[PDB]
Write a protein that binds this ligand. Sequence first.
Ligand SMILES: CC[C@H]1OC(=O)/C=C/[C@H](C)[C@@H](O[C@@H]2O[C@H](C)C[C@H](N(C)C)[C@H]2O)[C@@H](C)C[C@@H](C)C(=O)/C=C/[C@H]2O[C@@H]2[C@]1(O)CO[C@@H]1O[C@H](C)[C@@H](O)[C@@H](OC)[C@H]1OC
Ligand SMILES: [Mg+2]
Ligand SMILES: [Mg+2]
Ligand SMILES: [Mg+2]
Ligand SMILES: [Mg+2]
Ligand SMILES: [Mg+2]
Ligand SMILES: [Mg+2]
Ligand SMILES: [Mg+2]
Ligand SMILES: [Mg+2]
Ligand SMILES: [Mg+2]
Ligand SMILES: [Mg+2]
Ligand SMILES: [Mg+2]
Ligand SMILES: [Mg+2]
Ligand SMILES: [Mg+2]
Ligand SMILES: [Mg+2]
Ligand SMILES: [Mg+2]
Ligand SMILES: [Mg+2]
Ligand SMILES: [Mg+2]
Ligand SMILES: [Mg+2]
Ligand SMILES: [Mg+2]
Ligand SMILES: [Mg+2]
Ligand SMILES: [Mg+2]
Ligand SMILES: [Mg+2]
Ligand SMILES: [Mg+2]
Ligand SMILES: [Mg+2]
Ligand SMILES: [Mg+2]
Ligand SMILES: [Mg+2]
Ligand SMILES: [Mg+2]
Ligand SMILES: [Mg+2]
Ligand SMILES: [Mg+2]
Ligand SMILES: [Mg+2]
Ligand SMILES: [Mg+2]
Ligand SMILES: [Mg+2]
Ligand SMILES: [Mg+2]
Ligand SMILES: [Mg+2]
Ligand SMILES: [Mg+2]
Ligand SMILES: [Mg+2]
Ligand SMILES: [Mg+2]
Ligand SMILES: [Mg+2]
Ligand SMILES: [Mg+2]
Ligand SMILES: [Mg+2]
Ligand SMILES: [Mg+2]
Ligand SMILES: [Mg+2]
Ligand SMILES: [Mg+2]
Ligand SMILES: [Mg+2]
Ligand SMILES: [Mg+2]
Ligand SMILES: [Mg+2]
Ligand SMILES: [Mg+2]
Ligand SMILES: [Mg+2]
Ligand SMILES: [Mg+2]
Ligand SMILES: [Mg+2]
Ligand SMILES: [Mg+2]
Ligand SMILES: [Mg+2]
Ligand SMILES: [Mg+2]
Ligand SMILES: [Mg+2]
Ligand SMILES: [Mg+2]
Ligand SMILES: [Mg+2]
Ligand SMILES: [Mg+2]
Ligand SMILES: [Mg+2]
Ligand SMILES: [Mg+2]
Ligand SMILES: [Mg+2]
Ligand SMILES: [Mg+2]
Ligand SMILES: [Mg+2]
Ligand SMILES: [Mg+2]
Ligand SMILES: [Mg+2]
Ligand SMILES: [Mg+2]
Ligand SMILES: [Mg+2]
Ligand SMILES: [Mg+2]
Ligand SMILES: [Mg+2]
Ligand SMILES: [Mg+2]
Ligand SMILES: [Mg+2]
Ligand SMILES: [Mg+2]
Ligand SMILES: [Mg+2]
Ligand SMILES: [Mg+2]
Ligand SMILES: [Mg+2]
Ligand SMILES: [Mg+2]
Ligand SMILES: [Mg+2]
Ligand SMILES: [Mg+2]
Ligand SMILES: [Mg+2]
Ligand SMILES: [Mg+2]
Ligand SMILES: [Mg+2]
Ligand SMILES: [Mg+2]
Ligand SMILES: [Mg+2]
Ligand SMILES: [Mg+2]
Ligand SMILES: [Mg+2]
Ligand SMILES: [Mg+2]
Ligand SMILES: [Mg+2]
Ligand SMILES: [Mg+2]
Ligand SMILES: [Mg+2]
Ligand SMILES: [Mg+2]
Ligand SMILES: [Mg+2]
Ligand SMILES: [Mg+2]
Ligand SMILES: [Mg+2]
Ligand SMILES: [Mg+2]
Ligand SMILES: [Mg+2]
Lengths: 271, 47
Amino acid sequence: AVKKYRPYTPSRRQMTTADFSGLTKKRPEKALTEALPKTGGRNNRGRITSRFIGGGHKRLYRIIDFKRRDKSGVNAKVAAIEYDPNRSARIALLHYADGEKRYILAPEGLTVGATVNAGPEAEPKLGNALPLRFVPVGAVVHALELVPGKGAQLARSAGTSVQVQGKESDYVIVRLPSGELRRVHSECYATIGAVGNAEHKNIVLGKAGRSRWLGRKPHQRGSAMNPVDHPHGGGEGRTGAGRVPVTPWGKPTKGLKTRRKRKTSDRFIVT
Amino acid sequence: MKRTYQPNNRKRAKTHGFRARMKTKSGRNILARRRAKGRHQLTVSDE
RNA sequence: AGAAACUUGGAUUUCUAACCUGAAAAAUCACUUUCGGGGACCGUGCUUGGCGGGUA
RNA sequence: GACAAGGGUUCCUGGGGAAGGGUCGUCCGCCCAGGGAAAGUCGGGACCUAAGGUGAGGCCGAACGGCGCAGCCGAUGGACAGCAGGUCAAGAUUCCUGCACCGAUCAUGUGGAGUGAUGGAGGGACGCAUUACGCUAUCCAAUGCCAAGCUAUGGCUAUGCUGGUUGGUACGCUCAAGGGCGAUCGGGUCAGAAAAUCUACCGGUCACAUGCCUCAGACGUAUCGGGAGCUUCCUCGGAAGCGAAGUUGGAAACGCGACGGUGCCAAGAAAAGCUUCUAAACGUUGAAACAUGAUUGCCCGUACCGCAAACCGACACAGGUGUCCGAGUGUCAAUGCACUAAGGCGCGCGAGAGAACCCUCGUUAAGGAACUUUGCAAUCUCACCCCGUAACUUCGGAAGAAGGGGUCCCCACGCUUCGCGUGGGGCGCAGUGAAUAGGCCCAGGCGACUGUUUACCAAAAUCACAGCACUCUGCCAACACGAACAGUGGACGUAUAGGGUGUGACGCCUGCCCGGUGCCGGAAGGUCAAGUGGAGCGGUGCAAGCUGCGAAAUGAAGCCCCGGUGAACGGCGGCUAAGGUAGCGAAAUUCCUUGUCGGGUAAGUUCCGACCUGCACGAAAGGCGUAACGAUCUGGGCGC
RNA sequence: GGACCGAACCGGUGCCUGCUGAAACAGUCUCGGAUGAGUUGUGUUUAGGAGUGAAAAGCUAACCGAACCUGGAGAUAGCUAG
Ligand SMILES: CC[C@H]1OC(=O)/C=C/[C@H](C)[C@@H](O[C@@H]2O[C@H](C)C[C@H](N(C)C)[C@H]2O)[C@@H](C)C[C@@H](C)C(=O)/C=C/[C@H]2O[C@@H]2[C@]1(O)CO[C@@H]1O[C@H](C)[C@@H](O)[C@@H](OC)[C@H]1OC
Ligand SMILES: [Mg+2]
Ligand SMILES: [Mg+2]
Ligand SMILES: [Mg+2]
Ligand SMILES: [Mg+2]
Ligand SMILES: [Mg+2]
Ligand SMILES: [Mg+2]
Ligand SMILES: [Mg+2]
Ligand SMILES: [Mg+2]
Ligand SMILES: [Mg+2]
Ligand SMILES: [Mg+2]
Ligand SMILES: [Mg+2]
Ligand SMILES: [Mg+2]
Ligand SMILES: [Mg+2]
Ligand SMILES: [Mg+2]
Ligand SMILES: [Mg+2]
Ligand SMILES: [Mg+2]
Ligand SMILES: [Mg+2]
Ligand SMILES: [Mg+2]
Ligand SMILES: [Mg+2]
Ligand SMILES: [Mg+2]
Ligand SMILES: [Mg+2]
Ligand SMILES: [Mg+2]
Ligand SMILES: [Mg+2]
Ligand SMILES: [Mg+2]
Ligand SMILES: [Mg+2]
Ligand SMILES: [Mg+2]
Ligand SMILES: [Mg+2]
Ligand SMILES: [Mg+2]
Ligand SMILES: [Mg+2]
Ligand SMILES: [Mg+2]
Ligand SMILES: [Mg+2]
Ligand SMILES: [Mg+2]
Ligand SMILES: [Mg+2]
Ligand SMILES: [Mg+2]
Ligand SMILES: [Mg+2]
Ligand SMILES: [Mg+2]
Ligand SMILES: [Mg+2]
Ligand SMILES: [Mg+2]
Ligand SMILES: [Mg+2]
Ligand SMILES: [Mg+2]
Ligand SMILES: [Mg+2]
Ligand SMILES: [Mg+2]
Ligand SMILES: [Mg+2]
Ligand SMILES: [Mg+2]
Ligand SMILES: [Mg+2]
Ligand SMILES: [Mg+2]
Ligand SMILES: [Mg+2]
Ligand SMILES: [Mg+2]
Ligand SMILES: [Mg+2]
Ligand SMILES: [Mg+2]
Ligand SMILES: [Mg+2]
Ligand SMILES: [Mg+2]
Ligand SMILES: [Mg+2]
Ligand SMILES: [Mg+2]
Ligand SMILES: [Mg+2]
Ligand SMILES: [Mg+2]
Ligand SMILES: [Mg+2]
Ligand SMILES: [Mg+2]
Ligand SMILES: [Mg+2]
Ligand SMILES: [Mg+2]
Ligand SMILES: [Mg+2]
Ligand SMILES: [Mg+2]
Ligand SMILES: [Mg+2]
Ligand SMILES: [Mg+2]
Ligand SMILES: [Mg+2]
Ligand SMILES: [Mg+2]
Ligand SMILES: [Mg+2]
Ligand SMILES: [Mg+2]
Ligand SMILES: [Mg+2]
Ligand SMILES: [Mg+2]
Ligand SMILES: [Mg+2]
Ligand SMILES: [Mg+2]
Ligand SMILES: [Mg+2]
Ligand SMILES: [Mg+2]
Ligand SMILES: [Mg+2]
Ligand SMILES: [Mg+2]
Ligand SMILES: [Mg+2]
Ligand SMILES: [Mg+2]
Ligand SMILES: [Mg+2]
Ligand SMILES: [Mg+2]
Ligand SMILES: [Mg+2]
Ligand SMILES: [Mg+2]
Ligand SMILES: [Mg+2]
Ligand SMILES: [Mg+2]
Ligand SMILES: [Mg+2]
Ligand SMILES: [Mg+2]
Ligand SMILES: [Mg+2]
Ligand SMILES: [Mg+2]
Ligand SMILES: [Mg+2]
Ligand SMILES: [Mg+2]
Ligand SMILES: [Mg+2]
Ligand SMILES: [Mg+2]
Ligand SMILES: [Mg+2]
Ligand SMILES: [Mg+2]
């Protein structure tokens, strides 16, 4: 379920592109779209900060409802499912019985025109948004809140599950997509099921221009540079001694986490 | 062979203009410096 | 050597007004507040020692 | 030819002639003086918002200062009412002429009541490629029309020749492709802060073609212009009057109908004007809105140069400079090439001479790369039809492989026209008759590929690239800018994500060595700062006391110590921790070297293939292959 | 369609010519790209140990292994000139 091409050009031989047939063809829905992509490659005072950002196709923002808390007890019909330029994880338009539209993340397997619901009295159906205290053990969910309110944060890229583990009082163990175990407040909301578009990993951008269309820009190696520019660079011929990043450090196995209050709220983080 | 100086009335008025010097302290220092030399308007705005 | 009290310190723990932080009619800030979560931690101020071609 | 930028009177007239002008100069973009520049409708402003800037309050900060919401500024974009002509020496959608339109204020009447926001709704609100129908600009033909006259060289006596052949407006039961369309009643409060007769959702009803609505544009009638020319004056050459015709056939946009259709993924501003709703307020005798008359129309820009002698280049400089129009004939097409129209120019020293030599060209006997570092350079090839076309391959390609043929004029016949096929005939050395137009092939090294780079000696085998791997980061993320508990980037992102690093399509693969170093983990022991501790030692005082010094014990991270770790830094040898698994090897690596054999050549220090004796190959500083690609580098061959 | 040929346009491959140039980087010829990682206008943001950089120590107003201007400043000059 992904497009391919005859080698009619050297670069179409490997290029592959995602299936769109399930996406409703419709404009992003005005007023739910603050647009203002305002692409910005640099940093607050004109310096570049994350290297190598660069212009790609202009985007508009779709305002997702990442909390889904104020519509508790209120059914919503699935209007359509759509491309989102900025999310890697298709959105689902929602027509509430209130008669107000709102975007959501698209759960894998959420068919158009299904009814979905929010709030503590909400059966653990696909696409429902309910608190972790009410999620049955072992259930797979996405779109979960790190804190009660403030919105979801941890399971949002396509194919990202977070499976419930145990239940300490006022808290709930969970397995993050990274595999780390995390205590999380039972008052946080989450949505049932995995994120959709699960096969997004396997698209292969067949040429340079593709990474450019995505707004990634050519990414220099240090070894190509000069001593002035980067530690690996310089020397006649090719190599490097000590292995370190841009400004110096490990890139192998220097732990980067500090000694925070968060460190008490997760079991066995590694991998 | 495009050369270094490509005129532009808004460019020149914007950088170098009297409102631009007066803005920053060090520009107002250029203003006091030129007045002290008695320049025929060093200020670039409307000479 | 056994009890009470004044306790003063250390560690486990737990709590909530300091402090951090998030949603709500008022987008940064202030407010009430429901509240929510964190929480004497972190942040920061002074001082101790280690690392420190990133720089000089 | 018309503009923007930029320049600044360079424009027009009348004068001038020192200097500028590469010579001259009576001339000039030079000198002097005088004049010229006209806007309710074109562009901007009294309208709007983007990036960005700025910012009361607010968040930071040795000072100065840095941030930052609303708000405000900011066109390169949104919105918005006029067209056709005439004409100063010099302006013109600005003035004059003919007709038109837009808002405002007021007056007469109709109307007859509701108007309806700093707030809601909807809408303005958008991509890329390709494409059907109709049409205009606009261009072409003619024995259509109109006007002028002549013609002669040999002929034509006009069915020859030259020129011209409609723009605006208004009406029109005339033709007309294309294009836009739901209407409504009620329900839910949980939706738009509240409200709402507006919008969103739900449901009852027709929502077939249709049916409305729309005119691009055409035809017609009228009308205001224009119109080839003609008439007279003429102060050197201008001025004023009059004015025919307007056919039929064909071609055609990137413009118009438009916000059409279809497909695609990388998923294509905002805000006001605008249309709906109400709150509040006034009003419900005198409202909205309509019509007719009137008065009203502010500020800035308009000259001239504007692919260049008027702008950037010190120059009247062979350079550079964003947009728009850019006719004709021929030629598959075209903005190409050749000639040419309108229009613009002959480049501000000139004349002779026809030596050496130097530049840019034309031809060349016989030979044909013998030249040379090298076929460097310059030939050869060349367009469009037709036939034909290899190893190898990722089955797309290599491919315009290679190679061969045709190409002009006339007649007849056929056909889907312009045009083409067929048959016959003619002419020249020659028929893409001139101009624009690939030389090809075999075989290697390197990189897969398109791309990128040393502005001004290097375009590459360099960078990047898709793909691969390690490692980090749980979100106020890791990392990065930063006076800083500010703010910001990462990112309005969330492990299918983001940072860092090395490798570098694809295929088969990626070995041995954890001793040293880095990293990750361990933790019995050794060690280790300040601080807590205060044994004891000393000064001074008669004393109380005041005072200098200071030991054990205890006290973190860190290092010693232990284990692991290689797409971590690394190592894989000498007549240590290990010592090269596959692959390749005289190589972009080979010193001895022109290694030895073979191939190619008459002859081969180069190049191909083998061997291995690898001075000093080898597996993601990747090993070995690989079709295709290449202004890459190397050796051969054909052609010239 | 980071497909082909090829004008505009962007570029700068090889030779010659120019070398007190027509020009402080050019001309003729030839050559690369030419729907894309494309070309270009206006507005605007990032700068000195700093910015940028498909990476040359390139570029940062005609000579960048650390710009220009002013200042310390008559730096210091075991060196050369006079
Ligand atoms: C010929 C081209 C240029 O010269 C050279 O390359 C070289 C010239 C000499 C031979 C050389 O001497 C040699 O040095 C050696 C170290 C030693 C040797 N000894 C043994 C004698 C000596 O012989 C030099 C250093 C001498 C020195 C006076 C000098 O520096 C001259 C500089 C420039 O004027 C010259 C140019 O003529 C300018 O040409 C420019 O080319 C550009 C591409 C153009 O764009 C244009 O630029 C706008 C143009 O004009 C600038
Ligand atoms: Mg297929
Ligand atoms: Mg940097
Ligand atoms: Mg990469
Ligand atoms: Mg380098
Ligand atoms: Mg170097
Ligand atoms: Mg360094
Ligand atoms: Mg080396
Ligand atoms: Mg190095
Ligand atoms: Mg860094
Ligand atoms: Mg003055
Ligand atoms: Mg001014
Ligand atoms: Mg210290
Ligand atoms: Mg140093
Ligand atoms: Mg050191
Ligand atoms: Mg101007
Ligand atoms: Mg003149
Ligand atoms: Mg004179
Ligand atoms: Mg005089
Ligand atoms: Mg003279
Ligand atoms: Mg003279
Ligand atoms: Mg004159
Ligand atoms: Mg504004
Ligand atoms: Mg703004
Ligand atoms: Mg500011
Ligand atoms: Mg701002
Ligand atoms: Mg504008
Ligand atoms: Mg208008
Ligand atoms: Mg306007
Ligand atoms: Mg008028
Ligand atoms: Mg006249
Ligand atoms: Mg004029
Ligand atoms: Mg006119
Ligand atoms: Mg009403
Ligand atoms: Mg058409
Ligand atoms: Mg005729
Ligand atoms: Mg005629
Ligand atoms: Mg007619
Ligand atoms: Mg506004
Ligand atoms: Mg003019
Ligand atoms: Mg002017
Ligand atoms: Mg010139
Ligand atoms: Mg140009
Ligand atoms: Mg044309
Ligand atoms: Mg033509
Ligand atoms: Mg033609
Ligand atoms: Mg031409
Ligand atoms: Mg001219
Ligand atoms: Mg002959
Ligand atoms: Mg021969
Ligand atoms: Mg010889
Ligand atoms: Mg020879
Ligand atoms: Mg040789
Ligand atoms: Mg050659
Ligand atoms: Mg085969
Ligand atoms: Mg085949
Ligand atoms: Mg080939
Ligand atoms: Mg090909
Ligand atoms: Mg013959
Ligand atoms: Mg013949
Ligand atoms: Mg020819
Ligand atoms: Mg010729
Ligand atoms: Mg070789
Ligand atoms: Mg390459
Ligand atoms: Mg160079
Ligand atoms: Mg440059
Ligand atoms: Mg070069
Ligand atoms: Mg903060
Ligand atoms: Mg590499
Ligand atoms: Mg290995
Ligand atoms: Mg050999
Ligand atoms: Mg050798
Ligand atoms: Mg032989
Ligand atoms: Mg031999
Ligand atoms: Mg050689
Ligand atoms: Mg060999
Ligand atoms: Mg090697
Ligand atoms: Mg390696
Ligand atoms: Mg390699
Ligand atoms: Mg190889
Ligand atoms: Mg290339
Ligand atoms: Mg070469
Ligand atoms: Mg060769
Ligand atoms: Mg192409
Ligand atoms: Mg370049
Ligand atoms: Mg050029
Ligand atoms: Mg080519
Ligand atoms: Mg190509
Ligand atoms: Mg530095
Ligand atoms: Mg420079
Ligand atoms: Mg200069
Ligand atoms: Mg210097
Ligand atoms: Mg001195
Ligand atoms: Mg001093
Ligand atoms: Mg010194």
